[PDB]
């Protein structure tokens, strides 16, 4: 049994590779072929503790956990094969009041999902885990119906399923080489023979980086070491009739579960103490590594062993049977890379799983859907393989992975900041100047100003679930923009140059707005065939046939990949250049923006010559610039596109020329306060692959009646005719000392009916603003709802948008 032709080749037979093979086969894909080096489970999969919880600290990753567990419950019936899925429930423990607040944070984030999750009192915790030291226990975060599974049995069951639905699993059959073909397909080489695949999928665990390099890519992955300790039989544990639920001791930084009639616990030790396989990056994985472990090192986890011994006293007397030290393939931010890869044809990845056992199931069905449908079934850009780039070096990867390990169980605050591996090489000379004058935020390698320091006010990273040290400074920056004139570093924007004969036709088919006339810029959306908002851009028509597309920092390669695929798919004759790192951008915005800038250029910046949304090349003080009259602040302003090496000089000259006007800096936190007042939607919060543009309120940018048949046009017609079920609305609410940031539950009459997507304090009205999705019948202006913030429901009112009109809209009523 050998197939030389395959629809999809999956490289790697860990839980992830097998799960995917199963889903694709079951979903009806013919000639699915999986190639495994040695045997199924030979990588990290066989050694794992097998914890599978409904809990995730994120958002749509809850779906992945949800689908995994639901699958795992049904595999034994479906395949006729046991999986040893224990489901006593999981409890994360709170021993400080700040950790109780974290649970409240996580509850409002979880109440608008199907995932079942509660905060429980000590009494209840003690009932479920009677061997727990209750001295310090304040609360538990409890997910009933989950637990842990046997990684081997799971993978074996998934393999029988895959085989039952038509998949072919070959091993030993290592992939030794990979050659792309001009038609976009692949020749795959193994010792057993050649497969010509329409697409290939990397699922090769801690060999994923090596497989990537067969096709000239560098996957930012480093294998880390992780240990758990298995205890001998304990009388008090054997005596119990029901299994103990899975714990996490957050302050002690270890997970703990029942294993037979003993216990099993695995620490996440300090980032200073953890160990990883730097040698395996430099030299690759030792060949003949497989089905094997590293030497135990109890000494480096002692601090956490002791915290466990005191928290579960019974450990004190138990003996240790075994210690499992093995490798996990980490990416820098601890999350995997799951999706199709930019800059090559028909290569997909499902790699770098810190938590592969829990993610395998959901990721299989997710990737299957994306592969079969040409768009993801829900948004998981947080796992986009191309959120990383050239900046994500081996040195950055190593240091960030180390930090992500040691940070496994720290308190997760909103607006969290991490400093390992920073700054990357992805900076301009402007970084040296402004680093001491603000809190720099991390954005795909860039250092971007969040908020600026004020004399006689605390500057330090001071994270909180409530308002903190940046609150008043952000208010001043807000004033700065409304009253005077602010300067902001917008350099992180993804920037693409499109030209060639079919430039216009390509864009007209990609985007749902009309293509602007030369000299003009407009806001435009790339929709998926289902009519989901894959991206929000601005399109500048700079010279005939030649365009500049701008998108958010987090959307750079994500968007480029989509655009490049449409170009190749439709045989479009174009040249596409990623110029993200060649150019810097400065936003100058506020009433005195024209005044200040005019001083520095012979170009006429009067409202007469330079209309809103025009784009023009000029010089700002002998520095060449492409200036667009636009601002996501909604106030009068320009964005100044220039060479990266000119950012420092340009900035200097602008701040100098704005002396009179009391020019100053502003950052992204303030920007968010401004755009929200103007009712501007942000991609990733108000819309993404989970939303169509009509429910999100982007009607103004969607031209259904333009001749060209743009992607998603028909789905939109059909959606509109059917009538909307929900609508994005803008909410106001008085709060004590906490602002919505998005992802919070919206309640009405004792039931959750929707969620906030983003938020901010509005300094103009002295109330919190938020965007939220609610059912159409409750989307009327004036409607009262409640927003759940940090354990309290605050009443909220839907308001007429926008709260504040944009400067161009204000200027237009002056005449009228
Ligand atoms: C070490 C560890 C990991 C772990 C854990 C406890 C320990 C001590 N506890 C976990 C837990 O409680 N919950 C959880 O979700 N995960 C846990 N882990 C991590 C888990 O083991 C990994 O995340 C997961 O196993 C990764 O699975 P994946 O399918 O992504 O990768 P793999 O199992 O390593 O499989 C890779 C396979 O690919 C084959 N391979 C390699 N190169 C090739 C080529 N060239 N051609 C074909 N096949 C190839 C390997 O042989 C391997 O089988
Ligand atoms: N370059 C540029 N491109 C961008 C952003 C930017 O920050 N600047 N930011 C991202 C966010 N999206 C928008 C959305 C709307 C506007 C905007 O300005 N809206 C005006 C004008 C719309 C119109 O009438 O054409 C309004 O009043 O609604 C700006 C960026 C995407 N690309």
PDB file of N, CA and C in Angstrom, residues 473-540:
ATOM      1  N   UNK A 473      -2.511  60.354  32.458  1.00  0.00           N
ATOM      2  CA  UNK A 473      -1.713  60.700  31.282  1.00  0.00           C
ATOM      3  C   UNK A 473      -2.454  60.514  29.957  1.00  0.00           C
ATOM      4  N   UNK A 474      -3.229  59.437  29.845  1.00  0.00           N
ATOM      5  CA  UNK A 474      -4.013  59.192  28.649  1.00  0.00           C
ATOM      6  C   UNK A 474      -5.063  60.292  28.453  1.00  0.00           C
ATOM      7  N   UNK A 475      -5.620  60.791  29.552  1.00  0.00           N
ATOM      8  CA  UNK A 475      -6.560  61.911  29.524  1.00  0.00           C
ATOM      9  C   UNK A 475      -5.940  63.184  28.986  1.00  0.00           C
ATOM     10  N   UNK A 476      -4.736  63.510  29.448  1.00  0.00           N
ATOM     11  CA  UNK A 476      -3.988  64.627  28.883  1.00  0.00           C
ATOM     12  C   UNK A 476      -3.692  64.474  27.395  1.00  0.00           C
ATOM     13  N   UNK A 477      -3.321  63.270  26.974  1.00  0.00           N
ATOM     14  CA  UNK A 477      -3.032  63.045  25.568  1.00  0.00           C
ATOM     15  C   UNK A 477      -4.298  63.218  24.751  1.00  0.00           C
ATOM     16  N   UNK A 478      -5.422  62.747  25.293  1.00  0.00           N
ATOM     17  CA  UNK A 478      -6.709  62.979  24.665  1.00  0.00           C
ATOM     18  C   UNK A 478      -6.961  64.485  24.454  1.00  0.00           C
ATOM     19  N   UNK A 479      -6.777  65.276  25.514  1.00  0.00           N
ATOM     20  CA  UNK A 479      -6.884  66.738  25.430  1.00  0.00           C
ATOM     21  C   UNK A 479      -5.923  67.291  24.396  1.00  0.00           C
ATOM     22  N   UNK A 480      -4.683  66.806  24.436  1.00  0.00           N
ATOM     23  CA  UNK A 480      -3.641  67.259  23.533  1.00  0.00           C
ATOM     24  C   UNK A 480      -4.125  67.216  22.094  1.00  0.00           C
ATOM     25  N   UNK A 481      -4.792  66.130  21.725  1.00  0.00           N
ATOM     26  CA  UNK A 481      -5.235  65.958  20.357  1.00  0.00           C
ATOM     27  C   UNK A 481      -6.464  66.822  20.047  1.00  0.00           C
ATOM     28  N   UNK A 482      -7.414  66.912  20.976  1.00  0.00           N
ATOM     29  CA  UNK A 482      -8.638  67.690  20.757  1.00  0.00           C
ATOM     30  C   UNK A 482      -8.383  69.200  20.770  1.00  0.00           C
ATOM     31  N   UNK A 483      -7.434  69.656  21.591  1.00  0.00           N
ATOM     32  CA  UNK A 483      -7.196  71.088  21.777  1.00  0.00           C
ATOM     33  C   UNK A 483      -6.007  71.639  21.000  1.00  0.00           C
ATOM     34  N   UNK A 484      -4.891  70.915  20.997  1.00  0.00           N
ATOM     35  CA  UNK A 484      -3.672  71.397  20.354  1.00  0.00           C
ATOM     36  C   UNK A 484      -3.300  70.562  19.127  1.00  0.00           C
ATOM     37  N   UNK A 485      -2.269  69.732  19.242  1.00  0.00           N
ATOM     38  CA  UNK A 485      -1.787  68.933  18.126  1.00  0.00           C
ATOM     39  C   UNK A 485      -0.848  67.851  18.649  1.00  0.00           C
ATOM     40  N   UNK A 486      -1.181  66.594  18.355  1.00  0.00           N
ATOM     41  CA  UNK A 486      -0.414  65.456  18.829  1.00  0.00           C
ATOM     42  C   UNK A 486       0.384  64.789  17.729  1.00  0.00           C
ATOM     43  N   UNK A 487       1.526  64.210  18.096  1.00  0.00           N
ATOM     44  CA  UNK A 487       2.330  63.408  17.185  1.00  0.00           C
ATOM     45  C   UNK A 487       2.399  61.972  17.694  1.00  0.00           C
ATOM     46  N   UNK A 488       2.108  61.018  16.807  1.00  0.00           N
ATOM     47  CA  UNK A 488       2.085  59.595  17.163  1.00  0.00           C
ATOM     48  C   UNK A 488       2.924  58.775  16.178  1.00  0.00           C
ATOM     49  N   UNK A 489       3.674  57.804  16.703  1.00  0.00           N
ATOM     50  CA  UNK A 489       4.423  56.863  15.853  1.00  0.00           C
ATOM     51  C   UNK A 489       3.497  55.738  15.394  1.00  0.00           C
ATOM     52  N   UNK A 490       3.117  55.760  14.110  1.00  0.00           N
ATOM     53  CA  UNK A 490       2.237  54.735  13.525  1.00  0.00           C
ATOM     54  C   UNK A 490       3.000  53.748  12.633  1.00  0.00           C
ATOM     55  N   UNK A 491       4.318  53.695  12.807  1.00  0.00           N
ATOM     56  CA  UNK A 491       5.202  52.927  11.931  1.00  0.00           C
ATOM     57  C   UNK A 491       4.886  51.428  11.794  1.00  0.00           C
ATOM     58  N   UNK A 492       4.302  50.796  12.834  1.00  0.00           N
ATOM     59  CA  UNK A 492       4.016  49.357  12.724  1.00  0.00           C
ATOM     60  C   UNK A 492       3.068  48.887  11.605  1.00  0.00           C
ATOM     61  N   UNK A 493       2.229  49.765  11.078  1.00  0.00           N
ATOM     62  CA  UNK A 493       1.341  49.436   9.943  1.00  0.00           C
ATOM     63  C   UNK A 493       1.958  48.507   8.907  1.00  0.00           C
ATOM     64  N   UNK A 494       1.204  47.490   8.504  1.00  0.00           N
ATOM     65  CA  UNK A 494       1.570  46.685   7.364  1.00  0.00           C
ATOM     66  C   UNK A 494       1.370  47.517   6.112  1.00  0.00           C
ATOM     67  N   UNK A 495       2.356  47.506   5.218  1.00  0.00           N
ATOM     68  CA  UNK A 495       2.347  48.372   4.032  1.00  0.00           C
ATOM     69  C   UNK A 495       2.682  47.557   2.791  1.00  0.00           C
ATOM     70  N   UNK A 496       1.805  47.583   1.793  1.00  0.00           N
ATOM     71  CA  UNK A 496       2.014  46.834   0.558  1.00  0.00           C
ATOM     72  C   UNK A 496       1.932  47.717  -0.698  1.00  0.00           C
ATOM     73  N   UNK A 497       2.942  47.608  -1.564  1.00  0.00           N
ATOM     74  CA  UNK A 497       2.927  48.247  -2.872  1.00  0.00           C
ATOM     75  C   UNK A 497       2.394  47.295  -3.950  1.00  0.00           C
ATOM     76  N   UNK A 498       1.294  47.679  -4.590  1.00  0.00           N
ATOM     77  CA  UNK A 498       0.720  46.908  -5.686  1.00  0.00           C
ATOM     78  C   UNK A 498       0.848  47.684  -6.986  1.00  0.00           C
ATOM     79  N   UNK A 499       1.452  47.071  -7.999  1.00  0.00           N
ATOM     80  CA  UNK A 499       1.445  47.650  -9.353  1.00  0.00           C
ATOM     81  C   UNK A 499       1.449  46.556 -10.427  1.00  0.00           C
ATOM     82  N   UNK A 500       1.455  46.971 -11.693  1.00  0.00           N
ATOM     83  CA  UNK A 500       1.323  46.054 -12.826  1.00  0.00           C
ATOM     84  C   UNK A 500       0.028  46.324 -13.564  1.00  0.00           C
ATOM     85  N   UNK A 501      -0.219  45.566 -14.627  1.00  0.00           N
ATOM     86  CA  UNK A 501      -1.338  45.872 -15.519  1.00  0.00           C
ATOM     87  C   UNK A 501      -2.692  45.588 -14.856  1.00  0.00           C
ATOM     88  N   UNK A 502      -2.758  44.503 -14.085  1.00  0.00           N
ATOM     89  CA  UNK A 502      -4.000  44.093 -13.410  1.00  0.00           C
ATOM     90  C   UNK A 502      -4.110  44.554 -11.945  1.00  0.00           C
ATOM     91  N   UNK A 503      -3.323  45.550 -11.544  1.00  0.00           N
ATOM     92  CA  UNK A 503      -3.393  46.076 -10.176  1.00  0.00           C
ATOM     93  C   UNK A 503      -4.825  46.445  -9.795  1.00  0.00           C
ATOM     94  N   UNK A 504      -5.445  47.304 -10.598  1.00  0.00           N
ATOM     95  CA  UNK A 504      -6.810  47.760 -10.326  1.00  0.00           C
ATOM     96  C   UNK A 504      -7.804  46.596 -10.268  1.00  0.00           C
ATOM     97  N   UNK A 505      -7.738  45.697 -11.247  1.00  0.00           N
ATOM     98  CA  UNK A 505      -8.680  44.572 -11.321  1.00  0.00           C
ATOM     99  C   UNK A 505      -8.563  43.613 -10.127  1.00  0.00           C
ATOM    100  N   UNK A 506      -7.335  43.327  -9.717  1.00  0.00           N
ATOM    101  CA  UNK A 506      -7.080  42.530  -8.521  1.00  0.00           C
ATOM    102  C   UNK A 506      -7.740  43.141  -7.287  1.00  0.00           C
ATOM    103  N   UNK A 507      -7.464  44.414  -7.037  1.00  0.00           N
ATOM    104  CA  UNK A 507      -8.002  45.103  -5.867  1.00  0.00           C
ATOM    105  C   UNK A 507      -9.515  45.203  -5.908  1.00  0.00           C
ATOM    106  N   UNK A 508     -10.062  45.397  -7.106  1.00  0.00           N
ATOM    107  CA  UNK A 508     -11.500  45.545  -7.295  1.00  0.00           C
ATOM    108  C   UNK A 508     -12.204  44.237  -6.940  1.00  0.00           C
ATOM    109  N   UNK A 509     -11.534  43.120  -7.183  1.00  0.00           N
ATOM    110  CA  UNK A 509     -12.049  41.798  -6.825  1.00  0.00           C
ATOM    111  C   UNK A 509     -11.761  41.417  -5.355  1.00  0.00           C
ATOM    112  N   UNK A 510     -10.683  41.935  -4.789  1.00  0.00           N
ATOM    113  CA  UNK A 510     -10.374  41.665  -3.383  1.00  0.00           C
ATOM    114  C   UNK A 510     -11.233  42.474  -2.414  1.00  0.00           C
ATOM    115  N   UNK A 511     -11.516  43.724  -2.759  1.00  0.00           N
ATOM    116  CA  UNK A 511     -12.088  44.683  -1.801  1.00  0.00           C
ATOM    117  C   UNK A 511     -13.557  45.022  -2.071  1.00  0.00           C
ATOM    118  N   UNK A 512     -14.295  45.334  -1.005  1.00  0.00           N
ATOM    119  CA  UNK A 512     -15.742  45.539  -1.091  1.00  0.00           C
ATOM    120  C   UNK A 512     -16.133  46.996  -1.332  1.00  0.00           C
ATOM    121  N   UNK A 513     -15.158  47.899  -1.277  1.00  0.00           N
ATOM    122  CA  UNK A 513     -15.372  49.293  -1.608  1.00  0.00           C
ATOM    123  C   UNK A 513     -14.923  49.533  -3.048  1.00  0.00           C
ATOM    124  N   UNK A 514     -15.319  50.664  -3.631  1.00  0.00           N
ATOM    125  CA  UNK A 514     -14.801  51.035  -4.943  1.00  0.00           C
ATOM    126  C   UNK A 514     -13.318  51.339  -4.812  1.00  0.00           C
ATOM    127  N   UNK A 515     -12.599  51.156  -5.904  1.00  0.00           N
ATOM    128  CA  UNK A 515     -11.189  51.471  -5.953  1.00  0.00           C
ATOM    129  C   UNK A 515     -11.063  52.979  -6.135  1.00  0.00           C
ATOM    130  N   UNK A 516     -10.328  53.651  -5.231  1.00  0.00           N
ATOM    131  CA  UNK A 516     -10.283  55.107  -5.324  1.00  0.00           C
ATOM    132  C   UNK A 516      -9.598  55.582  -6.596  1.00  0.00           C
ATOM    133  N   UNK A 517      -9.948  56.790  -7.034  1.00  0.00           N
ATOM    134  CA  UNK A 517      -9.297  57.424  -8.175  1.00  0.00           C
ATOM    135  C   UNK A 517      -7.887  57.822  -7.756  1.00  0.00           C
ATOM    136  N   UNK A 518      -6.978  57.903  -8.719  1.00  0.00           N
ATOM    137  CA  UNK A 518      -5.607  58.357  -8.471  1.00  0.00           C
ATOM    138  C   UNK A 518      -5.567  59.683  -7.694  1.00  0.00           C
ATOM    139  N   UNK A 519      -4.709  59.735  -6.672  1.00  0.00           N
ATOM    140  CA  UNK A 519      -4.617  60.880  -5.761  1.00  0.00           C
ATOM    141  C   UNK A 519      -5.452  60.734  -4.500  1.00  0.00           C
ATOM    142  N   UNK A 520      -6.291  59.700  -4.450  1.00  0.00           N
ATOM    143  CA  UNK A 520      -7.228  59.531  -3.350  1.00  0.00           C
ATOM    144  C   UNK A 520      -6.978  58.248  -2.556  1.00  0.00           C
ATOM    145  N   UNK A 521      -7.413  58.288  -1.303  1.00  0.00           N
ATOM    146  CA  UNK A 521      -7.371  57.152  -0.407  1.00  0.00           C
ATOM    147  C   UNK A 521      -8.792  56.881   0.087  1.00  0.00           C
ATOM    148  N   UNK A 522      -9.123  55.604   0.273  1.00  0.00           N
ATOM    149  CA  UNK A 522     -10.361  55.228   0.964  1.00  0.00           C
ATOM    150  C   UNK A 522     -10.172  53.984   1.841  1.00  0.00           C
ATOM    151  N   UNK A 523     -11.164  53.714   2.684  1.00  0.00           N
ATOM    152  CA  UNK A 523     -11.133  52.584   3.595  1.00  0.00           C
ATOM    153  C   UNK A 523     -11.860  51.455   2.898  1.00  0.00           C
ATOM    154  N   UNK A 524     -11.290  50.252   2.929  1.00  0.00           N
ATOM    155  CA  UNK A 524     -11.801  49.144   2.127  1.00  0.00           C
ATOM    156  C   UNK A 524     -11.582  47.810   2.820  1.00  0.00           C
ATOM    157  N   UNK A 525     -12.476  46.853   2.590  1.00  0.00           N
ATOM    158  CA  UNK A 525     -12.447  45.568   3.302  1.00  0.00           C
ATOM    159  C   UNK A 525     -12.290  44.368   2.389  1.00  0.00           C
ATOM    160  N   UNK A 526     -11.379  43.466   2.744  1.00  0.00           N
ATOM    161  CA  UNK A 526     -11.251  42.200   2.046  1.00  0.00           C
ATOM    162  C   UNK A 526     -12.159  41.199   2.736  1.00  0.00           C
ATOM    163  N   UNK A 527     -13.187  40.744   2.015  1.00  0.00           N
ATOM    164  CA  UNK A 527     -14.124  39.770   2.563  1.00  0.00           C
ATOM    165  C   UNK A 527     -13.777  38.368   2.092  1.00  0.00           C
ATOM    166  N   UNK A 528     -14.167  37.374   2.900  1.00  0.00           N
ATOM    167  CA  UNK A 528     -14.058  35.956   2.535  1.00  0.00           C
ATOM    168  C   UNK A 528     -15.286  35.598   1.707  1.00  0.00           C
ATOM    169  N   UNK A 529     -15.248  34.489   0.956  1.00  0.00           N
ATOM    170  CA  UNK A 529     -16.438  34.115   0.165  1.00  0.00           C
ATOM    171  C   UNK A 529     -17.758  34.033   0.959  1.00  0.00           C
ATOM    172  N   UNK A 530     -17.684  33.640   2.225  1.00  0.00           N
ATOM    173  CA  UNK A 530     -18.849  33.626   3.119  1.00  0.00           C
ATOM    174  C   UNK A 530     -19.284  35.034   3.514  1.00  0.00           C
ATOM    175  N   UNK A 531     -18.459  36.028   3.227  1.00  0.00           N
ATOM    176  CA  UNK A 531     -18.779  37.401   3.579  1.00  0.00           C
ATOM    177  C   UNK A 531     -18.311  37.780   4.972  1.00  0.00           C
ATOM    178  N   UNK A 532     -17.199  37.205   5.409  1.00  0.00           N
ATOM    179  CA  UNK A 532     -16.601  37.581   6.682  1.00  0.00           C
ATOM    180  C   UNK A 532     -15.511  38.584   6.417  1.00  0.00           C
ATOM    181  N   UNK A 533     -15.254  39.445   7.392  1.00  0.00           N
ATOM    182  CA  UNK A 533     -14.287  40.528   7.223  1.00  0.00           C
ATOM    183  C   UNK A 533     -12.887  40.013   7.558  1.00  0.00           C
ATOM    184  N   UNK A 534     -12.203  39.511   6.537  1.00  0.00           N
ATOM    185  CA  UNK A 534     -10.847  39.030   6.652  1.00  0.00           C
ATOM    186  C   UNK A 534      -9.870  40.149   6.969  1.00  0.00           C
ATOM    187  N   UNK A 535     -10.143  41.362   6.477  1.00  0.00           N
ATOM    188  CA  UNK A 535      -9.251  42.498   6.733  1.00  0.00           C
ATOM    189  C   UNK A 535      -9.883  43.858   6.437  1.00  0.00           C
ATOM    190  N   UNK A 536      -9.427  44.879   7.167  1.00  0.00           N
ATOM    191  CA  UNK A 536      -9.763  46.280   6.886  1.00  0.00           C
ATOM    192  C   UNK A 536      -8.481  46.999   6.476  1.00  0.00           C
ATOM    193  N   UNK A 537      -8.507  47.625   5.299  1.00  0.00           N
ATOM    194  CA  UNK A 537      -7.346  48.344   4.771  1.00  0.00           C
ATOM    195  C   UNK A 537      -7.675  49.797   4.514  1.00  0.00           C
ATOM    196  N   UNK A 538      -6.646  50.591   4.245  1.00  0.00           N
ATOM    197  CA  UNK A 538      -6.829  51.785   3.425  1.00  0.00           C
ATOM    198  C   UNK A 538      -6.150  51.543   2.072  1.00  0.00           C
ATOM    199  N   UNK A 539      -6.768  52.032   1.012  1.00  0.00           N
ATOM    200  CA  UNK A 539      -6.217  51.896  -0.322  1.00  0.00           C
ATOM    201  C   UNK A 539      -5.880  53.285  -0.849  1.00  0.00           C
ATOM    202  N   UNK A 540      -4.586  53.544  -1.059  1.00  0.00           N
ATOM    203  CA  UNK A 540      -4.130  54.792  -1.681  1.00  0.00           C
ATOM    204  C   UNK A 540      -3.776  54.536  -3.133  1.00  0.00           C
TER     205      UNK A 540
END
